[PDB]
Structure formats: C-alpha cells, structure tokens
Design a protein around this ligand. Structure first.
Ligand SMILES: [Mg+2]
Ligand SMILES: [Mg+2]
Ligand SMILES: [Mg+2]
Ligand SMILES: [Mg+2]
Ligand SMILES: [Mg+2]
Ligand SMILES: [Mg+2]
Ligand SMILES: [Mg+2]
Ligand SMILES: [Mg+2]
Ligand SMILES: [Mg+2]
Ligand SMILES: [Mg+2]
Ligand SMILES: [Mg+2]
Ligand SMILES: [Mg+2]
Ligand SMILES: [Mg+2]
Ligand SMILES: [Mg+2]
Ligand SMILES: [Mg+2]
Ligand SMILES: [Mg+2]
Ligand SMILES: [Mg+2]
Ligand SMILES: [Mg+2]
Ligand SMILES: [Mg+2]
Ligand SMILES: [Mg+2]
Ligand SMILES: [Mg+2]
Ligand SMILES: [Mg+2]
Ligand SMILES: [Mg+2]
Ligand SMILES: [Mg+2]
Ligand SMILES: [Mg+2]
Ligand SMILES: [Mg+2]
Ligand SMILES: [Mg+2]
Ligand SMILES: [Mg+2]
Ligand SMILES: [Mg+2]
Ligand SMILES: [Mg+2]
Ligand SMILES: [Mg+2]
Ligand SMILES: [Mg+2]
Ligand SMILES: [Mg+2]
Ligand SMILES: [Mg+2]
Ligand SMILES: [Mg+2]
Ligand SMILES: [Mg+2]
Ligand SMILES: [Mg+2]
Ligand SMILES: [Mg+2]
Ligand SMILES: [Mg+2]
Ligand SMILES: [Mg+2]
Ligand SMILES: [Zn+2]
Lengths: 150, 50, 104, 81
RNA sequence: ACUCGGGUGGAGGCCUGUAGCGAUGCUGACGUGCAAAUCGCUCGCAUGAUUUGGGUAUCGGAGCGAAAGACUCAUCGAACCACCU
RNA sequence: UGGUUGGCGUAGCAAAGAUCUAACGGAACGUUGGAUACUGGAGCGGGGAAGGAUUUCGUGCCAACGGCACUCGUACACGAGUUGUUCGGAUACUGAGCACAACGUUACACCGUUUUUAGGAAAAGGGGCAACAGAGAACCUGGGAUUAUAUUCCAAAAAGAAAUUGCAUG
RNA sequence: ACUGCAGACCGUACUCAUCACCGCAUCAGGUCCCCAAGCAUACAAUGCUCUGGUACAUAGAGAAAGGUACACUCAGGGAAGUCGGCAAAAUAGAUGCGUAAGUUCGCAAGAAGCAUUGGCUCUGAGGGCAACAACUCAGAACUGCUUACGGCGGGGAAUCCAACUGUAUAAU
RNA sequence: GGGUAAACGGCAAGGUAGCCAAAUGCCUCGUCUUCCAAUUAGAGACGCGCAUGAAUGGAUUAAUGAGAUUCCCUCUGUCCCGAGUUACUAUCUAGCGAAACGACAGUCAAGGGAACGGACUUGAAGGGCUAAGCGGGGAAAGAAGACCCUGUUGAGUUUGACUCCAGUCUG
RNA sequence: CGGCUCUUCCUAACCUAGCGGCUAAGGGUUGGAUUGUUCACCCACUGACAGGGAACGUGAGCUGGGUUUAGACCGUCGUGAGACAG
RNA sequence: AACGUGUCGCGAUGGAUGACUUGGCUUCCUAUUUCGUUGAAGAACGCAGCAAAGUGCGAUAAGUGGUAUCAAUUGCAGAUUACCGAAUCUUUGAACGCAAACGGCGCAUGGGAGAAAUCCCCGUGCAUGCCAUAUUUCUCAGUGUCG
RNA sequence: GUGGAAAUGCGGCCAGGUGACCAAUCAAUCCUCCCACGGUGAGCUUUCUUUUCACCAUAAUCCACUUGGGCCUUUCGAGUUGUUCGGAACGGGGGCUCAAGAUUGAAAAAUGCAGUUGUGAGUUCUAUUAAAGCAAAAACCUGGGG
RNA sequence: GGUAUCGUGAGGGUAGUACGAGGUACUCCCAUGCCGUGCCUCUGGUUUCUGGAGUUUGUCGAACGGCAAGUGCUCCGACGCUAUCGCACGGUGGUUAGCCAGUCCCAAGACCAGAUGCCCA
RNA sequence: CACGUCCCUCUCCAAACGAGAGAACAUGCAUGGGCUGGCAUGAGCGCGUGGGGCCCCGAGGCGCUGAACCUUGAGGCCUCAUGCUGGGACU
C-alpha cells in the first residue's frame, strides 16, 4: 500500500500524482521508503519515475493556421461574430489614423510637405477624407504638385 | 483560519488534551465507577464554539 | 502556472497589488507590488502640481532619503513651484512698494 | 428560503466568551455580556430566574478563599504569634 | 439663416446575454423529499434606485420597511427567554 | 415514561454520465502498473477570510461510525506536527461608531450628552476604544528542508543575498 | 561610512466544502476573496483538451405495466386539444438588402421581409523599419451538400392596466 | 362670524369636460356593426350609466411589461390517435433499511338501523398462501374543520362606543 | 361546480327493430364557435344527435377554468377599520 | 401439506417487580456562626510517576508548614489519615496603571540576567470617589473679605 | 552648506505636501500565451512525420546609467483612438526634472534545470451620470522662521 | 400413490352493429363506418443493428482508424414493434326485438370413478 | 428406491418475477461460409480550380469498386463447414 511514497514522489518530482510512476514490479522496495530522502533514492534508482505530461498537439492547428492564412475557413457560414466583434471599427480607425498621422508627420519632418498643409491634411485625415496610406500618399503628391505648378 | 487569540488557543488546547480516553489503570481501582469517558468530544459533533 | 497569495492578506485591494514573478527556481511567484505614492506637490490651492526637484518617495523610505531628494535648493524648495516662489518674490516686493508709496 | 437555506446565511458571532463569566455570552458588537452583564461592575441577577441565580451563586465554584475565612471564623481566628 | 453626407466618439436607472442577483412558467420533479421551500428546464434584472464581505447603528405596547402587516435567528396582525402561572 | 410491535426485509438506498484489467495485499476493499473516462482554469484545481479546532501527519486499526462494503477513512488508538527582526496582528492610524470620566437626570444608573457652569498641561478644547479587506507595513530567492511547517527551517563557504530598528563602536 | 551587539509578543497545522462551516447529517440547500491554460468562437456562452485533480457518490442481472427525464422520432391533418397554444415545436449566427403603423421624434426596429453562407485552389485590398510583420475584408473560379455540432430572437394586429428602470408578500 | 375642497367628501351644490356594458353596467350573453361555418369571447360604436368622471384625479398616450385580453402567421403529438426508441426508475438479486398508519377486522346484495354496514336480519358467495399492478371501497391517513355557530373567550384594526392617559394649547 | 377519463344501470323511446299509438333498454346516440360551466344558443354532420341514475357516478385518477384566504383594482356601502352571495 | 392460529417446555429481547439505598424530602436544633480593595464570590488556566472527568491544590500546585495520630497508600509502581495557627495562593474578577476576541502595552521605583548601553525578565506602586491630614503644618487659585 | 543664466544639481511655532481616494482607454514593462529559430530530453514510427511534446529558469537588494508628463532656456498652428491646445508662450533647437522602462553590471551560476533569443497577441498595472463630485488620521516629508 | 398426457364442461363471461349502394317492394347482392378478435405480406411510423454513409467542432503528431459532443448532427436503414396509417376475420339454433342455448372466452372449489401412458421400494 | 418431476445449464413461439414452451450429445452452441438484406462504392495505391520550379502541391474526380462494411444479436435463412462439448433436489 504505497500511497505515502506516491504522495512523496509527486512532491519531489515536482508534479502531480498523475505523472509519477511507481514501478509496479517493485512495490516492496518502494514500500519501505518512509522519508523523502528514501524516496529520492528511489527516484534516482528508477523505481519511481515521472511520466511526461500527456500530449496536447497543435499540429492540427498549425496546419489550420496555414489554411487560414491562405484564406480558408473564412466565409459567411464560418462567422459567428458580428463584423465589428470579429474586427472592431475602433481598431481599424486607430490603425488607419495612427498611420495617417504618422505619414503626415514623416513628411513634415523631412519637409516633403509644408507645415501649412500638414494642418490641411492632419485635419482631413481625422475626417477620413483619406481611405488609406496610399490614398493620402498620393493626395500629398497631388495636393503638392498643385503647388509645384506655381 | 489562522486567527486565534491565544486565550482561545489555550482553551481549544485545554479541550484537546482533555479529549482523551480514561486511563486503563483507573478502572482497576477499588470501588471504581468510571468506564468510558463521558466527556469525549468530537469536532464533527459537539462544537466548542470559541 | 497559477499563483496564490503569500502575504497573509488575500484581497485585491489597491494596497495589496501583486506582481507575478518567474523565479530563478522557475517558480511563478506573486510579490507585493509597492504602494507607490505620488510625490510632493505644490499646495492644492495653487493648482496642486507635482514638484520638479522632488522624488515620489514613500514615507517608508523618505526618512532614509537625502534631504535634497525631496526638494530643490531654492526658497520654498520642497513646497512651491518656482513660479509660485517668484509670484511671491514679486508680490512681496511690489506690494510693499505700493505701501511705501501710500505714505506719500 | 427562511429555513435550511438561510441557515447558511448566518456567518458571524453575536457572542464570544466573556472575560468574567466565561459564558459565550459576550455580545461582541455591544461589548457586554448577556449573562454577567459585563463590563458592568454589578453582575446580572434576576429574581424571575432563580434557576439561574442558583446556577451561578457562591458555592458554585471553588469558594477558594471563602473556605479559608469560614474555617477561621469557626476557630475564632486562632493564631500563632 | 444651419442644414444634408461621412466618419469620430462611447452616452444611457439603453438592449441580447454570462457571472452574480432573482424567480415567471411548467400550476414540471419532489412532496413522510436532497431540502422544515429543494431540483430541473424556462424565464426576469444583469452600468445600476445594481450585487457583495467586513464593520456599525436602529428592535419588542419596539424596530425597519420603494408598504406585502412584510421582516426583526425555521418564531411576528406584536420576537424570543424567564417569570407571575 | 420506558420497552416492544405489525406494516417489513417492505418503501426505498434511481440528481451529477464509469469503470475495466492484471499483479499484489488481505482472513476476505485497498496499492501499483496498464486501460478508460471524467473535472475542463467561475474546475470533485491551488491558496485565504468566516467558521471549525486536531479534522493535519505517520503508524495501527476497523469493535462501533463512514445509510452497500472496506483490507480503506475526516472514524478509532498511539505517537508526532505548526519555528518569523521583516508574513498577519498588536506595539503605533483614523472611520461609521462606542463609551470611561466628569456633569447632569432618575425613587434608583443598568440613562444621556460625549467632554465637563469647566482649575482635565506634571516635565485652548480630559482618557480610551473601534478596520487581520481602509491607512500603515524593514526580505528575497534557492534548498537534497519534514511523515506532517516554512517568505518562519538551513550555519560559517550560514545556500545565500538583503533591508531594517535600537544602542554602541571606530 | 563602518562595525559590534540586540532585535521582544501572539497567529502560523488542517479545512474552507455535493464528507471539515451553517442547516439535528459526510444534507443535491447556503457561504466573502484571490490565481485561472489550449482549440473552436464574438465569448469567462457552449463543446471539448494539456496541467492540477478525479474515478467518491451502493452494486448486479435483465429490459413487464405505470412513471421520471436537464430524451427523442412520428404518416395525414394542423389548435379540431384546452379554461387558456398550457407544454412542445418554432425562430435563430453573420453579411447584404429591406423595414409599417404609431411616436414624446429618442424610437418603434432584430420591426416585418426576402437573400447569400461549405470545401477548395487563387486573386485584391489594408502596414512597419530601414537602404520584415499581422488578419481581417473583398473578389474568383472550381467543387460539394444527406442543408448534416454546439450556441442562438418566433413574428404580427389589437384592447385593458401601469408611463418607464426599479421594489415587493423569505415558504401558494 | 369668516375662509378653505390638488381638506374629507357631494354633485351646499345638483355631474361640467370627458370617457364606458371599461378591471367600474344589475338588467345582460344589452343593441348595432366587425371578426368565424358557427363567437356568452374580442374589437369598434351606442349610452335609459343599478352604481363613470375629473390630483377620492378625467381623458389620451409613444416606449417599457416573465402584467390581463383577443386574434393572426409560423409551428408543432394539444389533438385526431396513438405508435416506436432511449436513460433512470419500477421489476428480480446482493447489501442495507425506515416511515405513515395501526381498535378489530376486512366478499357481497337486500333490509332495517344515528336514516349509504366489515360485524346485525335474510340471502349469495368464499380452500389456503402468494407476486406484480391498481386505485373503486375501506364515509383510507393527514390536523381537537382555517367555514359556520356558541362562550357573559381572545387578539389586531377602527371610531364623533364607554372609561380614560400622555401631547398640545390656553389660564 | 365543471370538464376529462372509464364503467355501469334505468326508460314516461331520439334513432334503430317489429307492428298498428303500442310494444321494444338490445345497440347507438356527432364534431365544433362563444362561455369555467352545467345549461342555452349557434355551425356542420347524422339514422339520430332522448332524457336520466350510479354520494347532483368518478380529485390518494387528473385538470384547477368556476368557486376560489391572504396581495391588489373598480363600483356601491361605510366617519373609519372594513363590507358587497358585484 | 404450507402458512397461519393455539397450548405447553425451553431459550432470546425487554427491563418491570421485589429486596436493597453512603440519596432526597420534611421537621427540629446548636453556635464564640456571616464575604470583599489585607483582592471577594464567580470565570480561566494549570498541578499527580503513570490522571480525562470529578475532587484537592496554585509554579511551595491531589500540596509546604504546625498538631494529633499512627503503619500505611494501595490499580501498578513507589517510601497515611484527621485537624489547624505558619505560609504558598498562577490569569483574571468589584478589578483598580491603560487596554482587551491583544495572554498586549505603560510611567515611576528597586532588583535580575546580560551585554556590546539598547534589549529582556521580575517585584512594588500608579483607577475613581470621598473623609482625614499636611502634625517638622505641603504648594497654591479667586477684580470673595479685609489689611 | 554649494554648483548652475535658468529649470534645478550636490553636499518651538507656522505653512505646505505625502498619506489621499475614477470606470475605461491608451502606452510601457509584468505576466501568460502563441509563433519563428536553435539547442536538449522524450514520444510517435505498419506507412508517413527535417516530426509531435516537454524543457530552455533569473528573486529581493544595489550600481552605473527609451516612452509619458512638468518645467527652463533660446530663436494659425500643435495634438490625441477620443470629447484639446496655443502671446496667461504653440511650435523648433538645447537643457532641466518626475514617473515608469531599457540596457551595463553586483546578486548570479557555487542556483535552477535537464540529462534560446526573438516575434506576435491577450492580461496587467500606472471620461460619463452628477440636484452623485466621488473618507479620515497617525506616520512621514519639505519648507518659512527661527 | 406418484408423474404425465389427452379430454369432459357444470358454472361464469359473451357481441356484433350501423349506414349506403345495387338488384327487384321482401329476398338477393356489393362497399363502407363503427365495434371487436387478431396479424405485420405490403404501406406508413419507430432505430441503441449508433448497421452503412455523410458531416461539424474538440482530440488521438498525420493518413488510416477512431474517439468526445450524456446517441453531436444529417441521410438511408433491416429485425422487431406497431397504425383503421396496412391487413385478415366476426357462424347458429330454440323459445316468447327480447330471452335462453350454441358457436366464442375461462373453465373440476363442478374436487371429473372421464380416458389414457408409466412406475407403483 | 423405481418411474419420474424439479433445479443448475442451453433455447425461445414465453416472460415483471414465478409460470410457459422446448433441449437434454441435439447443427445444441460457437465461429466461418453461402444466402437474404442494408448501405453505398472502403483502404490503398494509380481528370482537375489553379499554383510552385517535366514534374511536384491541389478540394474534387476517375479506375480497380454494387465496392467496403454490416447481416441475428431480445434471439434473419441454409447442414453449408469446421469447433466444442451431465451435477444436484425430491419421492
Ligand atoms: Mg474560533
Ligand atoms: Mg424568520
Ligand atoms: Mg445577512
Ligand atoms: Mg441595462
Ligand atoms: Mg428581455
Ligand atoms: Mg392588508
Ligand atoms: Mg425493495
Ligand atoms: Mg471532459
Ligand atoms: Mg489523515
Ligand atoms: Mg479521534
Ligand atoms: Mg469618530
Ligand atoms: Mg485602533
Ligand atoms: Mg490593511
Ligand atoms: Mg507586518
Ligand atoms: Mg501543507
Ligand atoms: Mg498552510
Ligand atoms: Mg477555496
Ligand atoms: Mg454540521
Ligand atoms: Mg470557455
Ligand atoms: Mg462555462
Ligand atoms: Mg404528425
Ligand atoms: Mg385552440
Ligand atoms: Mg377550441
Ligand atoms: Mg372541445
Ligand atoms: Mg409555451
Ligand atoms: Mg415612420
Ligand atoms: Mg409598472
Ligand atoms: Mg411568495
Ligand atoms: Mg366594447
Ligand atoms: Mg371614483
Ligand atoms: Mg419591470
Ligand atoms: Mg373542535
Ligand atoms: Mg351566556
Ligand atoms: Mg375576562
Ligand atoms: Mg359529484
Ligand atoms: Mg376517489
Ligand atoms: Mg484532572
Ligand atoms: Mg486592569
Ligand atoms: Mg533580479
Ligand atoms: Mg443463439
Ligand atoms: Zn460574561
């Protein structure tokens, strides 16, 4: 009845009882292992072993994580969530606007664009008159060539 | 839990060492009446609510 | 890794904030997160602003800190913003100069 | 749910042991004893309950000194010099 | 004259709904029960007059009540204990 | 009031899915291995408060109890076990509050105010209490350290490393 | 700076729960706090899984009637049942359309109502830092359906009452 | 003597605006219309309103509602009209093991009778013991009927009952 | 109270049968709208939709709509608490 | 047959009964009979070689001392009984230095250990009210009365 | 006492501050999680699998030293995801300072473990209603004055 | 006396009913309804043959194969059970429509000296 | 003790349990086969959206393939083939 050692093995294997393995074939030598120091002798001595944690593979998932990248498993039937839960409008607006405010800020820093037009666009960027970076990227180009002519 | 005034710990300590079977040799005295301890307590039954 | 409290207290109050901490022994261990105080401020009636030369020492360690860690070496140094001192140095001077004129 | 399910709602103590009587009758919130009336100097004692007067009167305890002074009055307080 | 787009923002005794707090219906189970009021599903509220621990205050011809004579230790159209009895 | 009875070996012991196997043990359910499921992180997880107060742990035991059984038990018996300058609490905060004092009232203090018609300093407004979730609060890890405690134990290479309080010392 | 000595008190085990507390019990009830993984998913819903835990809820054999169920299915009909659509079914996610009366102009509204939705192989879009990073949306062919988890509103038209959220006879 | 009804209330004044067989209408299922094959229902009108009506608030109201109510679509085992399957029970076993109840019992028909017998009269049945059901009877059990009445019994509430007592105010 | 469910018995017979009103208790006597109902009245079928008893058959069979205690609303009554077989 | 019924004989369950009674109840009496700030009663915690309770006691702890008495106590072991003067009498409690679900904390006094003093233990005092007194006649306060 | 033009750096009483008080969000770290790489161990292995799983740890304390804010100075734009801001000083250059944080190292590899970093996500911590405005105090700090 | 077998049948139960069409105004036909007694070939329903397939999420490293989702879900699905939702069947004699007997159902506590088989230490 | 009945055991037209029907060395049971059915074309290897540098990746598709599997079990068929084979109670 080596229920004590199993208490002990689990503690000094630094795991649960579920993982510790008391050798079925040598219950008696395990049986007289009253001290943690006795059991530690049994652990090096191989009567007691910690089993590896039961596997929980991600290979099904990583293979899925490939297919999702390629757009698999994406469509209408595969969507529980509202389009806003599934990807927040505030999340897009921040990203969109942090990006615009940064590019306006990059040109103002290299002065590709006037410190004047920066307000002209910093404030239009906030009214999403610019869908993208390259929408603003070309507006800065065409808001500027209009100046180049004069 | 942990908390106990020592006065309560002294009392549970009191009732704890008081919670003992009668000595065997006491029953062998002349004119003895006692057999079992009539004041055995069990935590799961009588409560020493302190 | 799930953690539990180590100090005898066990409530998620503001004064009992804790920090999860992987240890050298590869334990993951909650540690008391210090009850940081904001530091010295100019007085509440003067807009209550954090002072510049002063550290936000907890008074538990403020006793052991150097004196100038909690002040600047200016008049009212641990008490007033520099503008607040200058407000007075002007207001002391200019107000007395009008009174000195009201004798005439 | 006034029965067994509200018995679980009750969690505190009204009374802890008294410093005098040792009864679990010390109302912790009104720091007094329901039994001895402690901290009041004069101990609680009612004639409508003599079963309780009798229960805690003198002779109920050791009468630790009173045995000594009783023996002395009986012996005229005889004394060695 | 201050309106029509579009975004932004995150308001509300706002909505759906967890937890939690309830408790409508089945007049379901149980009904000498698991239970001296419970179980199941259903359902209601769930940012608020919310829920909740500790502490503290207010009670018996009294207390407390968004008021049902409700609740005040399974006791309330007057608790419980003892006593008169 | 005690005992006994029929009903009656009956009504039932049907909520939460679950055990199987071999080996061993034993006088005959446990233990281990394997298998199989379950919980499914708002857990039949790991720590605490209240509450409980020895239930802890080991050995033994299984008479009684664990509504079946037990070889097992939170049961029984015996022996153990809880280690702190730093954790929490007090020392040492105040809070809703409370109440000693005094004073007043009451046939009566077991009432009330909570400062007292009041000389409250002993070397302007008396004393105290009231929070283990508020304020305060000097310590960390490693351990081969237990049957059972550890931020508490470890020993001179303190495994070690700190911070901190008091006094004193150059 | 240093060093030297000293650093006292009490708590400390265990529990915290379908057997350790309250409920006469190892009672399906009640009981504050903290930590809290992976996958699907909008998710602390739900399902399932590593870790940590369990395998304790008396068991066996077999499968009358009648029951209980957090079990279904039912031809044709479709509320005729009934006091009463009670109970059950039904709706259902997301996207795009579309949305009436009435209105205090907020709403009503998820009104209502159609519609598309898988798999797969592609495409497009959306950024960062200098001189590599997401993962949503969009589209396209091809192809598949037994319409095939879980979870998830039934709707409408009216009358009475109360304006609203709320409270409230613990145990009809 | 005066004032006061968003005092109690009425409709001294005689019910105004409204609204209704309304949760308020006896008559009554009112009458008409609408809904159906058919409607004591509903909705909408009507108003001889037993007994509507204005902060004892009147009317009307979008939104809200586990509120009452009617109908509709969908839907279905609600039903026609039940059938089949599941799992746990029940059933049988091993273990364990109550309770309620319990005068005594316990087949009926007639009769009589405290006026509906298990005991009596006269007939008719009935071998005994069982197991599972069952729910007709045992006026089965449950609790000295919560109904009602009685008592020179209670308590709660009310009050312009009797008797008072504080409070208030006045002197 | 009612229904539902199930059985049963009667006949001053509704249908059916035999007669010429009589005999005849045999077997049968519908499905629905309103309403708790019974009852009534309607719609439809039907050969017909007869009337009754069985503790106004039948609640340890159910259902709980009626009656329906406490909650509440209205009308009327009441100075009021409260009453109303409304 | 069986079950069931019944008689009898034994036996179990049960605990009446009878006898017993170091208990109660009631009556009567006696006296050098009436607690406590010199810490009472009550409560707590402890003390025996094995001792939980009860009793006894209080860190001098089922007792120390005095007295009488005697040879025991007695479950085992091991080498008393009765009374009463001297003491002992822990934490508390009117409880009183301040508190108190704290075996907490003071101030002053003396001691102790100790130690590189700080810490630590201990004893005693330290509540309020009131009366007396300041016996070598304490220190004071009052726009009280005067001087 | 003292440096610095300045922001500021270093070496009884009185008044002020800390105590001290907000949902969220944003950001940083924390943490957890994922991925990539690399090692190490284990497992699958009929077939297939440069594969699946696990692990790759870094304590307080101390020492040197990017983001957000305040400020100094000097010579219509600024700004946030967002309801702002600016001669009562915006922006730009340099500086100061606070708050987090990073890295350098001491601890500390004599430990752990067993026979590596980095990268992504989440978590974490540090306005609104308001006729609601969202404790106190000791301790402690700093000053003014002495 | 056992055991067994075939029967007897006192007694008790007891049921068929209605409608319509044809044919000619009885007979005679032919369907149906209800009732009743069965049965399951067919047809429908039912699936825990979880049979076979498909399929969703989780999971087993993957394919295969599974597995979990309290039978995951969808399709088909035998056996069986069952439906007026299928199908078969529902008979006479005698007395005064009744009624009785029979057929039909239980039938020896109706105690069958009915028969019969076997053994009767 | 006879005959025999019963139990145990096996089968099911029976069945809550008793009872019933049967068996009693028997194609009885067991697997297997054949069949009748069911489903619906297995595993495995060997035309195609495009894609990657002649092949590879590719859902789906094709071929072997009315295949695969299942088919008596609360109890389909076939003797077709092999396999395995009394004790107790009572009078
Ligand atoms: Mg306690
Ligand atoms: Mg109560
Ligand atoms: Mg409570
Ligand atoms: Mg809301
Ligand atoms: Mg809702
Ligand atoms: Mg009332
Ligand atoms: Mg039973
Ligand atoms: Mg699971
Ligand atoms: Mg144990
Ligand atoms: Mg014990
Ligand atoms: Mg206060
Ligand atoms: Mg305090
Ligand atoms: Mg605190
Ligand atoms: Mg501390
Ligand atoms: Mg432990
Ligand atoms: Mg512990
Ligand atoms: Mg817990
Ligand atoms: Mg208990
Ligand atoms: Mg989840
Ligand atoms: Mg959940
Ligand atoms: Mg159907
Ligand atoms: Mg209907
Ligand atoms: Mg109807
Ligand atoms: Mg009907
Ligand atoms: Mg419903
Ligand atoms: Mg509109
Ligand atoms: Mg309302
Ligand atoms: Mg209620
Ligand atoms: Mg009308
Ligand atoms: Mg009115
Ligand atoms: Mg509401
Ligand atoms: Mg009576
Ligand atoms: Mg009279
Ligand atoms: Mg009287
Ligand atoms: Mg009746
Ligand atoms: Mg009845
Ligand atoms: Mg003792
Ligand atoms: Mg004291
Ligand atoms: Mg570190
Ligand atoms: Mg067979
Ligand atoms: Zn007391």
């Amino acid at each position: 009845s080596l229920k004590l050692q199993a208490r002990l093995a689990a503690d000094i294997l630094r795991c649960g009882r579920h993982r510790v393995w008391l050798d079925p074939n040598e219950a008696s030598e395990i049986s007289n292992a009253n001290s943690r120091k006795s059991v530690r002798k049994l652990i090096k001595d191989g009567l007691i072993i910690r089993k590896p944690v039961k596997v929980h593979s991600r290979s099904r998932w990583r293979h899925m994580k490939e297919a999702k990248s390629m757009g698999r498993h994406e469509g209408a039937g595969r969507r529980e969530g509202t389009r806003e839960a599934r990807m927040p409008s505030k999340e897009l607006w921040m990203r969109r606007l942090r990006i615009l405010r940064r590019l306006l800020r990059k040109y103002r820093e290299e002065k590709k664009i006037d410190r004047h037009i920066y307000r002209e666009l910093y404030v239009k960027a906030k009214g999403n008159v610019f869908r993208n970076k390259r929408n603003l990227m070309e507006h800065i180009h065409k808001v500027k060539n209009e100046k180049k002519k004069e | 839990g942990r908390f106990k005034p020592l006065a309560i710990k002294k009392k549970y300590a009191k009732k704890l060492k008081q919670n003992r079977p009668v000595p065997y040799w006491i029953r062998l005295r002349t004119g003895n009446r006692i057999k079992w301890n009539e004041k055995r307590r069990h935590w799961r039954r009588t409560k020493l609510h302190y | 890794p799930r953690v539990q409290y180590r100090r005898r207290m066990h409530y998620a109050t503001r004064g009992n904030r804790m920090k999860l901490v992987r240890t050298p022994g590869n334990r993951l261990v909650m540690q008391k997160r210090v009850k940081r105080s904001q530091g010295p401020h100019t007085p509440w009636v003067l807009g209550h602003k954090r002072l510049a030369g002063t550290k936000a020492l907890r008074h538990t360690e403020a006793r052991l800190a150097s004196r100038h860690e909690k002040s600047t070496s200016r008049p009212y140094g641990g008490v007033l913003s520099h503008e607040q001192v200058r407000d007075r140095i002007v207001r002391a001077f200019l107000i007395e100069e009008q009174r000195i004129v009201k004798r005439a | 749910t006034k029965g067994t399910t509200s018995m679980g709602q009750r969690h505190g103590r009204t009374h802890i042991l008294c410093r005098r009587c040792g009864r679990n009758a010390y109302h912790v919130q009104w720091e007094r004893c329901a039994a001895c009336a402690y901290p009041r100097a004069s101990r609680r004692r009612y004639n409508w309950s003599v079963k309780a007067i009798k229960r805690r009167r003198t002779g109920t305890g050791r009468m630790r000194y009173l045995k000594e002074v009783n023996r002395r009055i009986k012996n005229h307080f005889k004394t060695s010099l």
